């Protein structure tokens, strides 16, 4: 019962740097809905 | 599910992924000055 050679995958700049994206992306979405409403209501 | 995540010292997402950050970060700065002014001028 030999073992079949199985490839491996390493994690790099995936879930590490992504933590910083939440700031730009997260703020983008929140700003889109926030600015849109605040701006629309200002009209 | 034998597979799992891991962290190691390496260089990645140098000037490649950074291109996507410009969207979040860039919009953040532009939104800060834009929203601030638009909001301030509101009242």
CATH number of B11's domain: 6.10.250.1740
Query: Residue A33 and residue B35: Cα distance in Å, rounded?
Result: 12
- End-to-end, the C-alpha distance of chain A in Å comes to 73
CB of B6 closer than 8 Å to CB of A7: no
Domain containing residue A12: 1-43
Query: Residue B43 and residue B24: Cα distance in Å, rounded?
Result: 28
> B10-29 b/e with 16+ CB inside 10 Å = b?
eeebeeeeeeebeebbebbe
For testing contact with chain A, the best of B12, B15, B38, B41 (most A CBs within 10 A) = B12
CB of B41 closer than 8 Å to CB of A37: no
Q: Which residue's structure tokens are 């919009």? A: B27
Distance from chain centroid for Cα B7: 21
Contacts of B32 in chain A (CB under 8 A): none
- Domain count within chain A: 1
């Amino acid at each position: 019962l030999p073992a079949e050679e199985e490839l491996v995958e390493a994690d790099e700049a995936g879930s590490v740097y992504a933590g910083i994206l939440s700031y730009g992306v997260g703020f983008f979405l929140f700003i889109l809905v926030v600015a849109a409403v605040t701006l629309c209501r200002l009209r």
